[PDB]
Ligand binder design. Structure first.
Ligand SMILES: [Ca+2]
Ligand SMILES: [Ca+2]
Ligand SMILES: [Ca+2]
Ligand SMILES: [Ca+2]
Length: 148
Protein backbone atom coordinates (compact mmCIF):
# COMPACT_ATOMS: atom_id res chain seq x y z
CA UNK A 1 0.00 0.00 0.00
CA UNK A 2 2.05 2.92 -1.30
CA UNK A 3 1.41 6.57 -2.10
CA UNK A 4 2.90 10.09 -2.20
CA UNK A 5 4.16 11.31 1.19
CA UNK A 6 1.62 12.96 3.50
CA UNK A 7 3.92 15.96 3.78
CA UNK A 8 3.61 16.62 0.04
CA UNK A 9 -0.15 15.94 -0.01
CA UNK A 10 -0.60 18.46 2.81
CA UNK A 11 1.40 21.16 0.99
CA UNK A 12 -0.45 20.40 -2.26
CA UNK A 13 -3.75 21.02 -0.46
CA UNK A 14 -2.66 24.65 -0.34
CA UNK A 15 -1.85 24.53 -4.05
CA UNK A 16 -5.30 23.05 -4.67
CA UNK A 17 -7.01 25.86 -2.72
CA UNK A 18 -5.10 28.37 -4.87
CA UNK A 19 -7.51 27.42 -7.66
CA UNK A 20 -10.53 26.42 -5.54
CA UNK A 21 -11.50 29.77 -3.98
CA UNK A 22 -14.63 28.31 -2.34
CA UNK A 23 -13.06 25.21 -0.80
CA UNK A 24 -15.70 22.76 -2.10
CA UNK A 25 -12.88 20.30 -2.90
CA UNK A 26 -13.45 20.38 -6.65
CA UNK A 27 -12.06 23.08 -8.96
CA UNK A 28 -14.61 24.21 -11.58
CA UNK A 29 -13.81 25.19 -15.16
CA UNK A 30 -14.04 28.87 -14.15
CA UNK A 31 -12.23 28.63 -10.82
CA UNK A 32 -9.16 27.17 -12.58
CA UNK A 33 -9.88 29.15 -15.73
CA UNK A 34 -9.33 32.40 -13.87
CA UNK A 35 -5.73 31.33 -13.18
CA UNK A 36 -5.37 30.06 -16.77
CA UNK A 37 -4.90 32.30 -19.86
CA UNK A 38 -8.25 34.04 -19.31
CA UNK A 39 -6.37 36.33 -16.93
CA UNK A 40 -4.31 37.73 -19.80
CA UNK A 41 -5.29 36.90 -23.38
CA UNK A 42 -8.76 35.94 -24.71
CA UNK A 43 -8.83 32.13 -24.97
CA UNK A 44 -11.77 30.33 -26.57
CA UNK A 45 -14.01 28.25 -24.25
CA UNK A 46 -12.92 25.21 -26.23
CA UNK A 47 -9.37 25.74 -24.96
CA UNK A 48 -10.51 25.82 -21.33
CA UNK A 49 -12.59 22.70 -21.92
CA UNK A 50 -9.56 20.96 -23.42
CA UNK A 51 -7.32 21.72 -20.42
CA UNK A 52 -10.02 20.65 -17.98
CA UNK A 53 -11.08 17.40 -19.69
CA UNK A 54 -7.51 16.26 -20.39
CA UNK A 55 -7.02 15.79 -16.61
CA UNK A 56 -10.67 15.28 -15.54
CA UNK A 57 -10.98 11.58 -16.38
CA UNK A 58 -14.54 11.67 -15.05
CA UNK A 59 -15.71 14.34 -17.48
CA UNK A 60 -17.59 16.22 -14.73
CA UNK A 61 -16.06 19.57 -15.70
CA UNK A 62 -14.38 19.69 -12.28
CA UNK A 63 -10.83 18.91 -11.17
CA UNK A 64 -11.01 16.83 -8.00
CA UNK A 65 -8.04 16.54 -5.63
CA UNK A 66 -6.74 13.28 -7.14
CA UNK A 67 -7.23 14.61 -10.69
CA UNK A 68 -5.05 17.58 -9.70
CA UNK A 69 -2.53 15.12 -8.23
CA UNK A 70 -2.53 13.12 -11.51
CA UNK A 71 -0.11 15.69 -12.91
CA UNK A 72 2.54 14.47 -10.42
CA UNK A 73 1.80 10.82 -11.29
CA UNK A 74 2.64 11.63 -14.92
CA UNK A 75 6.15 12.69 -13.89
CA UNK A 76 6.89 9.60 -11.77
CA UNK A 77 4.79 6.43 -11.66
CA UNK A 78 5.13 5.99 -7.90
CA UNK A 79 6.24 9.56 -6.93
CA UNK A 80 8.00 7.80 -4.02
CA UNK A 81 11.74 7.79 -3.19
CA UNK A 82 12.18 4.63 -1.04
CA UNK A 83 13.89 1.78 -2.88
CA UNK A 84 13.06 -0.55 0.02
CA UNK A 85 9.42 -0.40 -1.18
CA UNK A 86 10.50 -2.22 -4.37
CA UNK A 87 11.37 -5.22 -2.16
CA UNK A 88 7.67 -5.84 -1.45
CA UNK A 89 7.48 -7.05 -5.05
CA UNK A 90 9.97 -9.90 -4.57
CA UNK A 91 8.53 -10.77 -1.14
CA UNK A 92 5.20 -11.57 -2.82
CA UNK A 93 6.80 -12.94 -6.00
CA UNK A 94 8.28 -16.03 -4.32
CA UNK A 95 8.87 -17.83 -7.64
CA UNK A 96 11.07 -14.90 -8.72
CA UNK A 97 9.58 -14.90 -12.23
CA UNK A 98 9.77 -11.07 -12.49
CA UNK A 99 5.98 -10.51 -12.71
CA UNK A 100 3.00 -11.22 -10.42
CA UNK A 101 0.93 -14.25 -11.38
CA UNK A 102 -2.39 -15.62 -10.17
CA UNK A 103 -0.77 -18.83 -8.88
CA UNK A 104 1.75 -16.78 -6.91
CA UNK A 105 -1.00 -14.80 -5.18
CA UNK A 106 -3.20 -17.89 -4.62
CA UNK A 107 -0.47 -19.35 -2.41
CA UNK A 108 -0.06 -16.16 -0.35
CA UNK A 109 -3.82 -16.05 0.18
CA UNK A 110 -3.78 -19.74 1.13
CA UNK A 111 -0.99 -19.01 3.64
CA UNK A 112 -3.23 -16.32 5.18
CA UNK A 113 -6.09 -18.84 5.23
CA UNK A 114 -8.15 -17.05 2.58
CA UNK A 115 -9.97 -19.20 0.00
CA UNK A 116 -9.96 -17.04 -3.12
CA UNK A 117 -10.64 -18.35 -6.63
CA UNK A 118 -8.86 -17.45 -9.87
CA UNK A 119 -11.64 -15.03 -10.81
CA UNK A 120 -11.30 -13.29 -7.43
CA UNK A 121 -7.61 -12.69 -8.19
CA UNK A 122 -8.56 -11.30 -11.63
CA UNK A 123 -10.30 -8.35 -9.95
CA UNK A 124 -6.83 -7.16 -8.92
CA UNK A 125 -5.14 -8.29 -12.14
CA UNK A 126 -7.41 -6.06 -14.27
CA UNK A 127 -6.41 -3.10 -12.08
CA UNK A 128 -2.75 -3.71 -12.86
CA UNK A 129 -2.89 -5.04 -16.39
CA UNK A 130 -4.54 -1.99 -17.93
CA UNK A 131 -2.53 -2.35 -21.17
CA UNK A 132 -3.49 -6.04 -21.49
CA UNK A 133 0.09 -7.12 -22.18
CA UNK A 134 -0.31 -10.22 -19.99
CA UNK A 135 2.39 -9.34 -17.45
CA UNK A 136 2.28 -7.43 -14.17
CA UNK A 137 5.54 -5.57 -13.46
CA UNK A 138 6.24 -3.19 -10.53
CA UNK A 139 4.70 -0.13 -12.23
CA UNK A 140 1.56 -2.16 -12.92
CA UNK A 141 1.55 -3.42 -9.28
CA UNK A 142 1.39 0.22 -8.10
CA UNK A 143 -1.93 0.53 -9.98
CA UNK A 144 -3.54 -2.03 -7.60
CA UNK A 145 -2.48 0.04 -4.59
CA UNK A 146 -3.93 3.27 -5.99
CA UNK A 147 -7.09 4.63 -7.65
CA UNK A 148 -8.32 3.41 -11.06
CA1 LIG B 1 -14.54 25.04 -6.35
CA1 LIG C 1 -13.86 15.13 -12.05
CA1 LIG D 1 5.67 -14.31 -10.04
CA1 LIG E 1 0.79 -5.00 -17.97
Amino acid sequence: ADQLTEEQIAEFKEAFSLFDKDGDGTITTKELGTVMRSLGQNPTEAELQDMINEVDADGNGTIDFPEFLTMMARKMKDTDSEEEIREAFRVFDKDGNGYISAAELRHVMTNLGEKLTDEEVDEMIREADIDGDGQVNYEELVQMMTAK
